[PDB]
Short mmCIF file of C-alpha atoms and ligand atoms in Angstrom, two decimals:
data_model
loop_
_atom_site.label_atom_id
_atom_site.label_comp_id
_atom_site.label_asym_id
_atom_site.label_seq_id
_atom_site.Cartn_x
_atom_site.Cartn_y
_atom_site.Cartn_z
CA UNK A 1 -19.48 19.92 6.77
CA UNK A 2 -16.68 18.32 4.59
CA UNK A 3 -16.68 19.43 0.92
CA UNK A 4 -16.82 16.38 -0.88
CA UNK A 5 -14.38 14.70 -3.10
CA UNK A 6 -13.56 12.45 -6.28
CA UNK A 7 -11.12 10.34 -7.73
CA UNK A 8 -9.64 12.06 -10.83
CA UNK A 9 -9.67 8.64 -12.37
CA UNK A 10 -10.77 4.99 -12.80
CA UNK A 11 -14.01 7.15 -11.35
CA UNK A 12 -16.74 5.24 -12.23
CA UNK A 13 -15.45 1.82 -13.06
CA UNK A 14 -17.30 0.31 -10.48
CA UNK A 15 -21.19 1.74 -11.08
CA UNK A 16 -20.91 0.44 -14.65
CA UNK A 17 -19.92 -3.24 -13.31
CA UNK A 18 -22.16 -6.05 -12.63
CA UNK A 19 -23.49 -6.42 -8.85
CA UNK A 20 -21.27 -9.39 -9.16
CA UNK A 21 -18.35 -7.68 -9.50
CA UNK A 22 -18.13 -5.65 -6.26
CA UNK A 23 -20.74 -7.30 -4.09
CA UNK A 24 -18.63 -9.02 -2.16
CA UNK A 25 -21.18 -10.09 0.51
CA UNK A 26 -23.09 -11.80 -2.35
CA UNK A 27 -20.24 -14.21 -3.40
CA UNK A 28 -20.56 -18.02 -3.06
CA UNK A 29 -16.87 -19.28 -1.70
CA UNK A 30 -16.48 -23.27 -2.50
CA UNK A 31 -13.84 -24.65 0.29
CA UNK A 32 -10.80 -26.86 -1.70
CA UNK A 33 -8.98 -29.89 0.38
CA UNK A 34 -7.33 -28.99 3.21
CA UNK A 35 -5.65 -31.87 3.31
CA UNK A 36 -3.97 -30.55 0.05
CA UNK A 37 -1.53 -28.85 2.17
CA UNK A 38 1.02 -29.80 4.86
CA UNK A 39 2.11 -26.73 7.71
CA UNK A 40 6.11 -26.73 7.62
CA UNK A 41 6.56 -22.98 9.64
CA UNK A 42 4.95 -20.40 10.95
CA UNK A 43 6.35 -17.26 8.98
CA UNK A 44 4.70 -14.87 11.06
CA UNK A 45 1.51 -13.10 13.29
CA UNK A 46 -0.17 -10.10 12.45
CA UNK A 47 -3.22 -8.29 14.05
CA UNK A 48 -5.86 -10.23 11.56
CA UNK A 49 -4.02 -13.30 10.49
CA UNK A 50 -1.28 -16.16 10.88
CA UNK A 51 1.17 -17.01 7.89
CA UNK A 52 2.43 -20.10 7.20
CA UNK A 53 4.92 -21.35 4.71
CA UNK A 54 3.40 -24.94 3.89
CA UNK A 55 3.84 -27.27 0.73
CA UNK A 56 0.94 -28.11 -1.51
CA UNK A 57 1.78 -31.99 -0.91
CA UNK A 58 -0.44 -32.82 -4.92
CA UNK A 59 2.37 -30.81 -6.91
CA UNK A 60 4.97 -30.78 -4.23
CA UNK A 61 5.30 -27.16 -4.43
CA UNK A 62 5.93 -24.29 -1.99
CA UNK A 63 2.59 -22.29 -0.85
CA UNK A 64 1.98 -19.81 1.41
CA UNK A 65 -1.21 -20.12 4.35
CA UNK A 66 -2.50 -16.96 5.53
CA UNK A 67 -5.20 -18.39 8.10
CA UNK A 68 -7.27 -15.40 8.85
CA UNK A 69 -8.43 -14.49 12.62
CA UNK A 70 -11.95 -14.30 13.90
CA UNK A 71 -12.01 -10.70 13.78
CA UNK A 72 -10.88 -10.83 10.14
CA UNK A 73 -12.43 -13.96 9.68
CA UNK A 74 -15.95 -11.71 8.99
CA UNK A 75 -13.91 -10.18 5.81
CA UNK A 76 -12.82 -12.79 4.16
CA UNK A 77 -15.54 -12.01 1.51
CA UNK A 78 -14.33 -9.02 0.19
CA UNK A 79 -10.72 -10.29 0.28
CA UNK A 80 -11.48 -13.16 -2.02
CA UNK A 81 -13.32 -11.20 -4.43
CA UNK A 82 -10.83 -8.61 -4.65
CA UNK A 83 -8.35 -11.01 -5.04
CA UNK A 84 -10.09 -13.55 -7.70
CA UNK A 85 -11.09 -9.91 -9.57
CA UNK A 86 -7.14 -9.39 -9.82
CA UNK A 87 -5.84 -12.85 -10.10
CA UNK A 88 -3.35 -12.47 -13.61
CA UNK A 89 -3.13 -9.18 -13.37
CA UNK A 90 0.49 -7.45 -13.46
CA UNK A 91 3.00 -8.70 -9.97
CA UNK A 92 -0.53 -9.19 -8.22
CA UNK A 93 -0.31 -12.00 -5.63
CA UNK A 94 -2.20 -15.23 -7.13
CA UNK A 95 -4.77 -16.67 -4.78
CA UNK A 96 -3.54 -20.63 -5.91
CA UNK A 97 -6.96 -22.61 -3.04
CA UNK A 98 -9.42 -21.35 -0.62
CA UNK A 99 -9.68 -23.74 2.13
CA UNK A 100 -11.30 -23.95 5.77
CA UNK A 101 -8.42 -24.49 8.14
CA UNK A 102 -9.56 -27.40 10.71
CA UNK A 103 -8.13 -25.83 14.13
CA UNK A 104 -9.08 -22.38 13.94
CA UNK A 105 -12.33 -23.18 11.50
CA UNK A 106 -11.48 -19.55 9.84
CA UNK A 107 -10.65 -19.35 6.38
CA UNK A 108 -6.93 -19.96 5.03
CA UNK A 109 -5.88 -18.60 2.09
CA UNK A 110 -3.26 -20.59 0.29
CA UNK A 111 -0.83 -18.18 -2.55
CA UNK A 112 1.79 -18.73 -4.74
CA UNK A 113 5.35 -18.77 -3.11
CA UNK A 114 7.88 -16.01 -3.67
CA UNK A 115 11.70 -16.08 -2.51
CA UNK A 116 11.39 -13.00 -0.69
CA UNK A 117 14.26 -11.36 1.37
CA UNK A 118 13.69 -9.22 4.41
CA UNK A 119 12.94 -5.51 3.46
CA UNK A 120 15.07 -4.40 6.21
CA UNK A 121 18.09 -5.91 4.41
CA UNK A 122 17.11 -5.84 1.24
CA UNK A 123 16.46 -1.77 1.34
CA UNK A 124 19.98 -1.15 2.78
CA UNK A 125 21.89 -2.51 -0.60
CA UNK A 126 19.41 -1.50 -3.69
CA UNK A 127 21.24 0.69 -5.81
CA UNK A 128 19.62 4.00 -7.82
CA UNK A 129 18.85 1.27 -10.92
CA UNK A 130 17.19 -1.39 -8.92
CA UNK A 131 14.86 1.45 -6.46
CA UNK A 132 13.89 2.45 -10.07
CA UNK A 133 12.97 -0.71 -11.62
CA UNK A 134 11.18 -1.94 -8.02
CA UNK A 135 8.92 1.49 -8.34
CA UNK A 136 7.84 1.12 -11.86
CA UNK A 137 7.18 -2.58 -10.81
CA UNK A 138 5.02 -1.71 -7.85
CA UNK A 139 3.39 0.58 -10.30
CA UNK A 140 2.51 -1.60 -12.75
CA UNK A 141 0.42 -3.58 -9.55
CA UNK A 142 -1.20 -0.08 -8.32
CA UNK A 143 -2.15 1.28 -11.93
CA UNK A 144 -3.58 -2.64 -12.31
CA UNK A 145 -6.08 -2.76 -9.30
CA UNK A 146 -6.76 1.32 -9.23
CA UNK A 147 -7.76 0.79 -12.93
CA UNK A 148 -10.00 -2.37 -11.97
CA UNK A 149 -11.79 -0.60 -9.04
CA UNK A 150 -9.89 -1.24 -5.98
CA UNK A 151 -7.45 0.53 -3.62
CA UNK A 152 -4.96 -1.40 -1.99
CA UNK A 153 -4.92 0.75 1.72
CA UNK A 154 -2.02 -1.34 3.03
CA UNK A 155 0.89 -0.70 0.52
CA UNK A 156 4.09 -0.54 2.70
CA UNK A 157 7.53 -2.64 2.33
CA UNK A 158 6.37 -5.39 4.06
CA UNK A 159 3.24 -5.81 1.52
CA UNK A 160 5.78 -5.78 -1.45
CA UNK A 161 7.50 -9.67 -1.48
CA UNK A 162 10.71 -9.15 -3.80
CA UNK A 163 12.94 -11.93 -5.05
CA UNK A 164 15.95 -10.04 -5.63
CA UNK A 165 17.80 -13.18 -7.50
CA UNK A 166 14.84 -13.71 -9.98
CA UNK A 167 13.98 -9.73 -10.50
CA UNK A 168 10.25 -10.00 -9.46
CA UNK A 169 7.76 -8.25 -6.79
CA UNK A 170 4.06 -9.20 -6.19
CA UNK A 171 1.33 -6.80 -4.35
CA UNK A 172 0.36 -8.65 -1.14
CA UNK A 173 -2.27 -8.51 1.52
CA UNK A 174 -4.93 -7.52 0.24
CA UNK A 175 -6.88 -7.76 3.74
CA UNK A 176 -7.31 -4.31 3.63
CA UNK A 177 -8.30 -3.50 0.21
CA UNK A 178 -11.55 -1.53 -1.24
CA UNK A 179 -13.79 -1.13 -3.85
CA UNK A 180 -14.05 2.49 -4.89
CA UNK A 181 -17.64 4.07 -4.95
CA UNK A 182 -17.73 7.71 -5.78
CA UNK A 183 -18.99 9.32 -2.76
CA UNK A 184 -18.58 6.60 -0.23
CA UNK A 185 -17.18 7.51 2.99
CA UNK A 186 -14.41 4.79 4.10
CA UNK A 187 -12.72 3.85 7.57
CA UNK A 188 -9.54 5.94 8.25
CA UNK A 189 -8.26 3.34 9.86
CA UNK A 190 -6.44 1.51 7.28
CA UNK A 191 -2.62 1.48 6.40
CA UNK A 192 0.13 0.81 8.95
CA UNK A 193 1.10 4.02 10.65
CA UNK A 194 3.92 5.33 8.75
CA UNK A 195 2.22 5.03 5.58
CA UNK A 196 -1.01 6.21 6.11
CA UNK A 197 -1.78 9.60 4.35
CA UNK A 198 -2.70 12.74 6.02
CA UNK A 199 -6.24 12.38 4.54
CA UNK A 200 -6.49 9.44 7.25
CA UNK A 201 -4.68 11.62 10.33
CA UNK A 202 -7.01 14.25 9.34
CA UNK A 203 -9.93 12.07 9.55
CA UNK A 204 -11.20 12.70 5.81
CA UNK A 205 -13.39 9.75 4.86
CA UNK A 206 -13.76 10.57 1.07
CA UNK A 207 -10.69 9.35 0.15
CA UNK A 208 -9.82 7.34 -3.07
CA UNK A 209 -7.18 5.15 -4.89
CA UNK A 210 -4.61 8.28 -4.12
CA UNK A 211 -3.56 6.84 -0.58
CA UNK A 212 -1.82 4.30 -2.27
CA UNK A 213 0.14 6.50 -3.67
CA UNK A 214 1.45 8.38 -0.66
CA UNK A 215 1.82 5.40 0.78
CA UNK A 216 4.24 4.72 -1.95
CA UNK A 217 5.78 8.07 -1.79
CA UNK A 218 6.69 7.15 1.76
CA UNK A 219 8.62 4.04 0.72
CA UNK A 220 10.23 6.13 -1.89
CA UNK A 221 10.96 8.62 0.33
CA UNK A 222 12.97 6.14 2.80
CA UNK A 223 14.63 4.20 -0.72
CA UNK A 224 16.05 7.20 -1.60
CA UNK A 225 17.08 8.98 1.79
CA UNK A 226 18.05 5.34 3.13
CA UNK A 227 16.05 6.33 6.61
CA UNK A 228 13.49 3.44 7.07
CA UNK A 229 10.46 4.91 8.17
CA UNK A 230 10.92 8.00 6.43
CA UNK A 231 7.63 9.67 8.74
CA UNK A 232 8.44 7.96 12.30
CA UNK A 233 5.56 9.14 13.62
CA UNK A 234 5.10 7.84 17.66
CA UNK A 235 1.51 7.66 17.28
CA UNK A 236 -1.47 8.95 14.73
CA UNK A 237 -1.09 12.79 15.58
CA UNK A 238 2.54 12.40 15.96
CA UNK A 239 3.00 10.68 12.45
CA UNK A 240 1.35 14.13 11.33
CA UNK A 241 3.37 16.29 13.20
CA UNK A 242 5.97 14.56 11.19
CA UNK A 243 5.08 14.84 8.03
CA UNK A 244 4.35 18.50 8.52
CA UNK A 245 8.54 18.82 9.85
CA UNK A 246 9.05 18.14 5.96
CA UNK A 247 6.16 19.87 3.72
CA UNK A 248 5.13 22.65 6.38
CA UNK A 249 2.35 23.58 7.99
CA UNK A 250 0.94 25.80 5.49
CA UNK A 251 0.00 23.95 3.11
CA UNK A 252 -1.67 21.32 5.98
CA UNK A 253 -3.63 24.36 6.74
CA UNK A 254 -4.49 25.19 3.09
CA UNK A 255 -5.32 21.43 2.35
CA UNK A 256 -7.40 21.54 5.35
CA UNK A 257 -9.38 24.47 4.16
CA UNK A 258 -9.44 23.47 1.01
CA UNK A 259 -12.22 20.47 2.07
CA UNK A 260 -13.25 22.18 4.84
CA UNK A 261 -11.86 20.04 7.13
CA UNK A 262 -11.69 20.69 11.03
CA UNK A 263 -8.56 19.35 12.11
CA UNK A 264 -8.91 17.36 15.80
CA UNK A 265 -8.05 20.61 18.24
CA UNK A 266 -5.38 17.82 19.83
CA UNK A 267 -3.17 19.31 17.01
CA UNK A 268 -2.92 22.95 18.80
CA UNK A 269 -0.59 22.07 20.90
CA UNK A 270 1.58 20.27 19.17
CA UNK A 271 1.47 20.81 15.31
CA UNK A 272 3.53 24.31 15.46
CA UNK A 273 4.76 26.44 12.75
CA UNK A 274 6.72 24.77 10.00
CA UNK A 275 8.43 25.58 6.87
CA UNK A 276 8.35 23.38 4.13
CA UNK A 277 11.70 21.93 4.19
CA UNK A 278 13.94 21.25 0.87
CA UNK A 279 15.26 17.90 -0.02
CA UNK A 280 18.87 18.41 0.38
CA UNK A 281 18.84 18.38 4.46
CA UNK A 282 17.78 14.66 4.12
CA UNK A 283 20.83 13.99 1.48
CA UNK A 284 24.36 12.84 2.80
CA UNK A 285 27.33 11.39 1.75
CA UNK A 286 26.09 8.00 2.12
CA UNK A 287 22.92 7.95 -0.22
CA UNK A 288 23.61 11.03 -2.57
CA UNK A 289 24.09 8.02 -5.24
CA UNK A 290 20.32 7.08 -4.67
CA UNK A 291 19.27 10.90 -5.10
CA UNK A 292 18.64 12.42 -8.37
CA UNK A 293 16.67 15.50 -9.57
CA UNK A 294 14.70 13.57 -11.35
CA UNK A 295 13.90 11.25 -7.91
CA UNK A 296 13.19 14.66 -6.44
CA UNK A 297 10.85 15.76 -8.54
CA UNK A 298 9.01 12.40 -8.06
CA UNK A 299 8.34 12.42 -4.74
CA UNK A 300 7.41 16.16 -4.59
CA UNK A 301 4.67 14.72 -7.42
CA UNK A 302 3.72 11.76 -4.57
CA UNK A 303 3.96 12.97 -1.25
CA UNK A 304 1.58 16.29 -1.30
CA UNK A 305 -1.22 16.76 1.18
CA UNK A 306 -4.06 17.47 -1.21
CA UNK A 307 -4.65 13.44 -2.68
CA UNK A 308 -6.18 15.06 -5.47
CA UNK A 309 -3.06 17.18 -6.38
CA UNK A 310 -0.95 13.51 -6.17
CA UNK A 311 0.58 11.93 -9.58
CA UNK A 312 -1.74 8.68 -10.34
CA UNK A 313 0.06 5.34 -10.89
CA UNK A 314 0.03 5.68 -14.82
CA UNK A 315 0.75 9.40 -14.51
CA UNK A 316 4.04 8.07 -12.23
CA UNK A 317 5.37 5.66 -14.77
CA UNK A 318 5.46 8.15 -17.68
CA UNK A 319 8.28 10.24 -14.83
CA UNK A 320 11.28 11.00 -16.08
CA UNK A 321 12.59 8.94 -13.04
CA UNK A 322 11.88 5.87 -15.37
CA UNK A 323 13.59 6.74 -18.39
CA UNK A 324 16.40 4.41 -17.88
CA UNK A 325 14.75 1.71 -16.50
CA UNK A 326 14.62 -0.88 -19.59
CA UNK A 327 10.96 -1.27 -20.78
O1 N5Q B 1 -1.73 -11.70 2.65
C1 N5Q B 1 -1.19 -12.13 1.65
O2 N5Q B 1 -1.73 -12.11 0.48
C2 N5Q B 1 0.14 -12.77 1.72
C3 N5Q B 1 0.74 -13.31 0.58
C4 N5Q B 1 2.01 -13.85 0.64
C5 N5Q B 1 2.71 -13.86 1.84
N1 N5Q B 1 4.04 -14.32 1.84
C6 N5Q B 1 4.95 -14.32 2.83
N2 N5Q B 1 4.70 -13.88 4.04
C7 N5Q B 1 5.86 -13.93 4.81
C8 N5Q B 1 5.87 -13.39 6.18
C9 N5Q B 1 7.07 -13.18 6.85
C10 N5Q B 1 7.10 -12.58 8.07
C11 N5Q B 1 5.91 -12.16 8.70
C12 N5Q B 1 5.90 -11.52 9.97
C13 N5Q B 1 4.72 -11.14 10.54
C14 N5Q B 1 3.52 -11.38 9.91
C15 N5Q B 1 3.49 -12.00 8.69
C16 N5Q B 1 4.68 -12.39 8.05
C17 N5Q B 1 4.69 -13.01 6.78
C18 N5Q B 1 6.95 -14.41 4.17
S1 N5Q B 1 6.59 -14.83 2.55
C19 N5Q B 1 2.12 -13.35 2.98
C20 N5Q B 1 0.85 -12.81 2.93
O3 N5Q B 1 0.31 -12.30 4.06
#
């Protein structure tokens, strides 16, 4: 069947660890107060949880309250160990309480409040200098949890909280994150549409931390070409279709063959015949400013269909597309 496949890196970390480590099932969760924490808004729903800004009424400060849902109520393991295994570690989200929330009696997860501002704005006035310095920022994050085990599966705009004024980002949601055993066959369903990688619309289960960085591609990919989603894919075989508009059919046929995987024979009828396309048809007057060769060259390193063949996070921040971001 498939021919199996490995992460080039951060491999083993995981089989060397302590049960402890990525057992999440295993882990003893004490509950904090509550009571700590007054509701002010509701910030948001999403298909597992609820997100509320609240205020920590002990230190008066600003938290955020994700209250999980039933359905992701059974997972609240793995998120908590994930997130206590990352907790100080480079614009990760810090997990501040744990505590049981006494109307839904799911878990709520209090964090640390950033002054975010909405992506949809905020995308349509960061200039060349600012996509760079955001990048190498969400980089530092992905080359942080990659290198500790984990793969993020959710990385998108909306999982990246910026403060523009203050010059920070943090990682979030981490609902969806992994631990990465070499070998292990994971759930394809994972990412939000746009940025899920064609390993996941071509139903490949051996995946590894590499689907973040597509993912990230994709949000590079609409930075640059100021087109947010860059893949507007109207479903899962259409948001391949898409993607192959761009790099071709080809090679989706040679990654395909490659691991010997049979694509879902759905795809006959509407995959086609594609050339890989070159970058300039997606440059215009309006964002040639955000374009670069050296931007080019960076997302041709992210956004290729064989995850194996894809730039790692540390790889990415030695690109040339950092140089003149200060370090
Ligand atoms: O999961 C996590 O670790 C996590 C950490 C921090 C955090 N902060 C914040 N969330 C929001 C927010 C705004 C609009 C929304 C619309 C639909 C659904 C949700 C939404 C959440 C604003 S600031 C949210 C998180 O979910």
């Amino acid at each position: 069947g498939p021919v199996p496949s490995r992460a080039r890196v951060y491999t083993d970390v995981n089989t060397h660890r302590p049960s402890e480590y990525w057992d999440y099932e295993s882990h003893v969760v004490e509950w904090g107060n509550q009571d700590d924490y007054q509701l002010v808004r509701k910030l948001g729903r999403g298909k597992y949880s609820e997100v509320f800004e609240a205020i920590n009424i002990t230190n008066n400060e600003k938290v955020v309250v994700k209250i999980l849902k039933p359905v992701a109520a059974a997972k609240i393991k793995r998120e908590i160990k994930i997130l206590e295994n990352l907790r100080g570690g480079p614009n990760i989200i810090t997990l501040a309480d744990i505590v049981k929330d006494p109307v839904s009696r799911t878990p709520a997860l209090v964090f640390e409040h950033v002054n975010n501002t909405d992506f949809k704005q905020l995308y349509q006035t960061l200039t060349d200098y600012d996509i760079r310095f955001y990048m190498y920022e969400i980089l530092k994050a992905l080359d942080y949890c990659h290198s500790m085990g984990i793969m993020h599966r959710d990385v998108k705009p909306h999982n990246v909280m910026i403060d523009h004024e203050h010059r920070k980002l943090r990682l979030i949601d981490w609902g969806l994150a992994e631990f990465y055993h070499p070998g292990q066959e994971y759930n394809v369903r994972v990412a939000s549409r746009y940025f899920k990688g064609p390993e996941l619309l071509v139903d490949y289960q051996m995946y590894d931390y590499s689907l973040d960085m597509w993912s990230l591609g994709c949000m590079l990919a609409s930075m640059i070409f100021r087109k947010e989603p860059f893949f507007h894919g109207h479903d899962n075989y259409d948001q391949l279709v898409r993607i192959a508009k761009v790099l071709g059919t080809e090679d989706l046929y040679d990654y395909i063959d490659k691991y010997n995987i049979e694509l879902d024979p759905r795809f006959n009828d509407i995959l086609g015949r594609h050339s890989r396309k070159r970058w300039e048809r997606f440059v215009h007057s309006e964002n040639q400013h955000l374009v670069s060769p050296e931007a080019l060259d960076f997302l041709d390193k992210l956004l290729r269909y064989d995850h194996q063949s894809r730039l790692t996070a540390r790889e990415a921040m030695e690109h040339p597309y950092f140089y003149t971001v200060v370090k």
